[PDB]
Amino acid sequence: LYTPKHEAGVCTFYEECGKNPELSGGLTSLSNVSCLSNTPARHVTGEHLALLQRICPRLYNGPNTTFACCSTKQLLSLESSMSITKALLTRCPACSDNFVSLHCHNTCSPDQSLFINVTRVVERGAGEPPAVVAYEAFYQRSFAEKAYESCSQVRIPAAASLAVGSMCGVYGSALCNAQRWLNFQGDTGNGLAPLDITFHLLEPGQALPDGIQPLNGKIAPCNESQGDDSAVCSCQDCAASCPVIPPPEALRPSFYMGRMPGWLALIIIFTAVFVLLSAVLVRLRVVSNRNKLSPHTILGRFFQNWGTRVASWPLTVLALSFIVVIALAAGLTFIELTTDPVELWSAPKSQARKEKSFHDEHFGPFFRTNQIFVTARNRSSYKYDSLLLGSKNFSGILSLDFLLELLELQERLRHLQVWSPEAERNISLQDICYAPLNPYNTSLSDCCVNSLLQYFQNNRTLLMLTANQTLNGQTSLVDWKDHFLYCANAPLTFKDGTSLALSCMADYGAPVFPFLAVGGYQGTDYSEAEALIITFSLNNYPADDPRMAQAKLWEEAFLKEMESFQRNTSDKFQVAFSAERSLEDEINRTTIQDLPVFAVSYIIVFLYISLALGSYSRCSRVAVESKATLGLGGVIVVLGAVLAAMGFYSYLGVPSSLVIIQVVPFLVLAVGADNIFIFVLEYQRLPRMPGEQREAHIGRTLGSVAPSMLLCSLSEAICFFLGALTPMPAVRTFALTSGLAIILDFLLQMTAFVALLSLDSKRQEASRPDVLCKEKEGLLLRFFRKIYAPFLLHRFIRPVVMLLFLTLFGANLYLMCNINVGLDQELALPKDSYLIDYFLFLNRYLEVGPPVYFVTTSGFNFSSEAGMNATCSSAGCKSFSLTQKIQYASEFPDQSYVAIAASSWVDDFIDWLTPSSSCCRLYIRGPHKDEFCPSTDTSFNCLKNCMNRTLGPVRPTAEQFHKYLPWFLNDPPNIRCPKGGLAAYRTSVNLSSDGQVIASQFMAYHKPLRNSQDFTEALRASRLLAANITADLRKVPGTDPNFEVFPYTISNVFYQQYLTVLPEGIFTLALCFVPTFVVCYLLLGLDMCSGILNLLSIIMILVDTIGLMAVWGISYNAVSLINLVTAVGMSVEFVSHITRSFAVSTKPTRLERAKDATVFMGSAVFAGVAMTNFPGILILGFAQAQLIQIFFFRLNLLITLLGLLHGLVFLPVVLSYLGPDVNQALVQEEKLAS
């Protein structure tokens, strides 16, 4: 009751012996089943051989050598049955015969027993061969897979769907393969197969069942011609024959010019200047060796007369100064603050602003996104064995119980209402939500909400349904798991192929894509996803519109609800969430948190002054000698000047921000306090002779020190005003406020402070204690005189320090090239914000990046044949058409940051117009003849197509195009016509009143972006692609000479600043060095040496700062730019005072001159500037924010240390060698004054 032998040359059945008894109720033509006959093969000749050779030549083995195991009647039945599939595959016959070969071999092969094992026996009649209902067959995997592939992409004659999609049963082309297709052909459950055939795809490598040889015969590839027919399958039908497009080439690294690396040009260009100026100084010294009224007196006399008159009348000047300061400060009532960080940290005018304006004008603003993530805390991944797909792995988060809870949370969020005080009413979701369909007369069901549960239309009942169905020999149950797996691989469908014939589209009328519902998966293993995503979209608006405020109120309630849920579900799963406004609020909160800490930092500075300028008598006599009055005076005058500058700018109408308020007084005080300290110290050091009154003494003191304060003030203020060139509002506002504040500080110091000091001296001479309650040499003068100066200036020390500092400069000059560029949001957040968890979840689980739009401007004719030819990607299109270029670019996501190929309204429009789709029809009779008749009208009053049937590509005329396009754009999709533009293209085409297109867009997605370098590189690659597209579209005749396309995305406005060669601050910082040289040169009497030495010192300090900044891993950005401008200003306090003090000296030799300047001015500068700056920085270590600790604490400590090391060590030595000569006029004036 089986076939004992299965070796070779013997078959298992020959003659047809009647109809199949087991199958009943088919009511269709079927081949008569043969009964078992295990006999040798029959010789086939004559007309039987003629038919056998005719149908499938592969079995022909010579005119009188052919054997076969089939009859002519069986062949006629075979031809009749096969004719339907043969008709279907008409597009490329070459592979179709291969399919036919598969059947005829199975029917007639003389070596039938080597691959067919009969397994079913039915006894038709006594003493007759028993009928065979079913059997099994053996094949090799590679044979069947290649045979499948030969027609796997072949289209039907209509050219829309794939032929394979009509031959894989329950599912279409999306989920079919060789095994499933072969199983379909042999399974009688479809009402078509005549008998049950089991198809085993035995692997060729491992031979497991012995005695059976799986087969593998001749298979014709697509591009292999069948002799001289020269009718290979076009690559539109099987894709194997299409030409290969070479991969994108590697590009050179950025920042290059000419034939060399860019930065290398900079260093030589920089270094040469450093060499050149140095040479000049040496030349001057050599000339000296070979050869061997002044402004100081005018300024001295002027300031002495000014100071004595001011000191005489202290109450009047103090009153007038106070009144002026209050009069300016009062302006703060008009203050307006900007809080949006993108407006603060981005240029107001650029290419991106133009593109944003155009996009917003023609298509409307980009929507707001509110998003949550959830992943399971503890579960174990399990397995499920489905009838359709086999054994699949499911993650813990995809458990049935969890989904119901998530459905409840989503349902609570949709209904939610908020109280609006201005509107005095409850704002609902449908008042502000974004909806792609029905923007007016909307309802709650239309609002755009993306989630996994959209595959079940949020219907709890549908999620819980199960059903029984039978697939070949197995009957079993199906549930939600199968439906989700089916929808994931085929997002657009109006019904499944299972018993649960539900649609997979969202309730609001659009398909939901897997990368928007789940995340944390590789490949196409959607069931293994780890995180679930729920996203709400809200409409944006102009700022003036009141509705935005209402929208913001809704977001507040959203955040509250999530926090409540987070508490309730603390142990089950872990959630992460964010709202659109959250970042704007979160950063601002941080600023408020650190406002008292800075405040503490100012008062500590006060205390230092009171001790530094004080005295004692053996111990603990602070109550009398400590200068509390002068400390309070200095601090109040400087902070008054700062408030006056802010008030003035508020009067003018310039906005400000919390950052400016936070950091301007600190940076201003750090320089302004030092003029006060130096002046007071000089006053204490200078004795007076009997007869002199204190007013003359104070006058003479101001005459002594006022030109140094004037020179330093002018240099600092001009440098700060030159800082205000970068377009970024924060930096421009900072620079202008600091520039005005320093000037007002200077003017106040020369009036109110002098008066206060005069009154303090008056109180001191009368031996009265301060209102709080022997002129011995100071330790600093003794220490510098006896220990420091004889040591530093020693003959065996100077070349060592010179070589050490020049080597340090060289090494830092090299190191300064390794700069990290960019600002990351992660720093700007508090150490415990929920946004940290949100960003970490985005970085690990989200599979796609931001969307990008390629927007097409006016000036292009889409109504012509050439226009369509160059844009869409159908059978008759250009090989490198726009859509094809984007699709190609999407295949190499690492070279060009595009992950998902763009859609195209033109291809869907042309496809929709096709007569065979029954989508564009018109009424044929009655009151509405020649009007549009929608596809949902099932009457018989419409039998006429929009277009007449033709051959080849479908192209409308201009009249048809302009008449029918507004109908296409408003057709909702349905089961009768899956294509249409209402659910996807409604707002992507802007039409004119005469039917012309003004603008259009093509939408695509980026690959995941994780840091600022990926956003920058994505912008570079996308702009390069858009440039190539415009460059080729401009060759089409008839277009406007100024037609272009551009890549809009929401993030471009901020990130565009990093695309240049010099990262914006280099030009301004380089420019800021000029006022040092110019002011120093002019004020000191046209002294070339002082100017050159000051400029070189400032340059060396800034290069060292940038080098060490690179070595300590601090990135370059606008905040670093602010601090570097401050450093350029501050270093003048370390250089200028010593330079001027050395220059104005009457000692006969340079070495002698250096010593006195070093001891007196060195000790005053050290005690003032260094000790002023260190306590106001060390306090900031407790700021509790990463932004402040990285860019203010460490960077200012670095700047201060480099300042002191260059100022007090290098500068005296270089002055000792190359300093200026003696001013002879001063010598003559000194001698005559006798």
Ligand SMILES: *[C@@H]1O[C@H](CO)[C@@H](O[C@@H]2O[C@H](CO)[C@@H](O)[C@H](O)[C@H]2NC(C)=O)[C@H](O)[C@H]1NC(C)=O
């Ligand atoms: C299609 O583009 C035109 C471009 O002009 C849009 O017309 C502008 O619409 C805005 C908003 O209503 C107005 O402020 C402008 O004044 C309009 N411009 C002109 C010249 O009238 C038009 O709105 C766009 N279509 C859609 C549906 O937004």
Ligand SMILES: *[C@@H]1O[C@H](CO)[C@@H](O[C@@H]2O[C@H](CO)[C@@H](O)[C@H](O)[C@H]2NC(C)=O)[C@H](O)[C@H]1NC(C)=O
């Ligand atoms: C959620 O799904 C259920 C299941 O189909 C819907 O219930 C059916 O609705 C149709 C249309 O009104 C009725 O004819 C059936 O009798 C309902 N069946 C049952 C068991 O009630 C339900 O309407 C869906 N929810 C919504 C809001 O439409």
Ligand SMILES: *[C@@H]1O[C@H](CO)[C@@H](O[C@@H]2O[C@H](CO)[C@@H](O)[C@H](O)[C@H]2NC(C)=O)[C@H](O)[C@H]1NC(C)=O
């Ligand atoms: C799906 O099939 C199962 C199995 O036949 C049905 O469950 C019942 O199972 C018991 C065995 O425990 C049988 O004795 C019953 O005859 C089965 N009932 C029926 C109606 O077949 C289950 O009810 C079926 N479900 C659906 C929706 O068809």
Ligand SMILES: *[C@@H]1O[C@H](CO)[C@@H](O[C@@H]2O[C@H](CO)[C@@H](O)[C@H](O)[C@H]2NC(C)=O)[C@H](O)[C@H]1NC(C)=O
């Ligand atoms: C795009 O090109 C087509 C084809 O030339 C233009 O259609 C012609 O338009 C002119 C005037 O608009 C008519 O007189 C012709 O009869 C049209 N048909 C032809 C030549 O077959 C169409 O106008 C162009 N669109 C634009 C915006 O210029």
Ligand SMILES: CC(C)CCC[C@@H](C)[C@H]1CC[C@H]2[C@@H]3CC=C4C[C@@H](O)CC[C@]4(C)[C@H]3CC[C@]12C
């Ligand atoms: C002060 C500085 C740091 C502000 C930085 C602003 C930038 C980097 C922020 C502001 C708005 C943000 C975008 C808001 C919306 C989304 C959609 C989301 O699906 C992908 C991320 C994306 C596209 C964000 C990218 C980053 C973004 C552009």
Ligand SMILES: *[C@@H]1O[C@H](CO)[C@@H](O)[C@H](O)[C@H]1NC(C)=O
């Ligand atoms: C099968 O055999 C019967 C008996 O000769 C015949 O009438 C019938 O036409 C055959 N073919 C079929 C059912 O396709």
Ligand SMILES: *[C@@H]1O[C@H](CO)[C@@H](O)[C@H](O)[C@H]1NC(C)=O
């Ligand atoms: C072939 O079929 C017979 C029954 O017809 C069965 O007993 C035998 O095990 C089968 N052989 C293989 C290798 O499956």
Ligand SMILES: *[C@@H]1O[C@H](CO)[C@@H](O)[C@H](O)[C@H]1NC(C)=O
């Ligand atoms: C047909 O295409 C395949 C693709 O792998 C290629 O290897 C083969 O050489 C091609 N044959 C011809 C004749 O072009």
Ligand SMILES: *[C@@H]1O[C@H](CO)[C@@H](O)[C@H](O)[C@H]1NC(C)=O
């Ligand atoms: C899984 O997590 C829960 C949550 O606390 C815990 O109680 C349970 O013990 C965990 N399972 C194992 C095996 O540790």
Ligand SMILES: *[C@@H]1O[C@H](CO)[C@@H](O)[C@H](O)[C@H]1NC(C)=O
């Ligand atoms: C998932 O299923 C496949 C096939 O059933 C199996 O090989 C794999 O080990 C499974 N993974 C887990 C984690 O169970």
Ligand SMILES: *[C@@H]1O[C@H](CO)[C@@H](O)[C@H](O)[C@H]1NC(C)=O
């Ligand atoms: C808004 O909804 C709350 C919910 O109970 C209700 O108490 C309140 O009265 C509503 N507001 C208005 C204006 O109806």
Ligand SMILES: *[C@@H]1O[C@H](CO)[C@@H](O)[C@H](O)[C@H]1NC(C)=O
């Ligand atoms: C979580 O919320 C639900 C409904 O608001 C409530 O029934 C449940 O008790 C809450 N959980 C806890 C732990 O209170």
Ligand SMILES: *[C@@H]1O[C@H](CO)[C@@H](O)[C@H](O)[C@H]1NC(C)=O
């Ligand atoms: C459009 O494409 C077809 C097919 O390549 C070509 O024959 C035709 O010349 C092209 N141009 C126009 C204006 O139809």
Ligand SMILES: *[C@@H]1O[C@H](CO)[C@@H](O)[C@H](O)[C@H]1NC(C)=O
């Ligand atoms: C189709 O052909 C008929 C007969 O030639 C003609 O009357 C009709 O206008 C044609 N329609 C189109 C859209 O070309």
Ligand SMILES: *[C@@H]1O[C@H](CO)[C@@H](O)[C@H](O)[C@H]1NC(C)=O
């Ligand atoms: C556009 O890209 C292609 C990529 O192969 C390149 O060969 C071509 O030079 C680019 N530029 C154009 C067409 O201006």
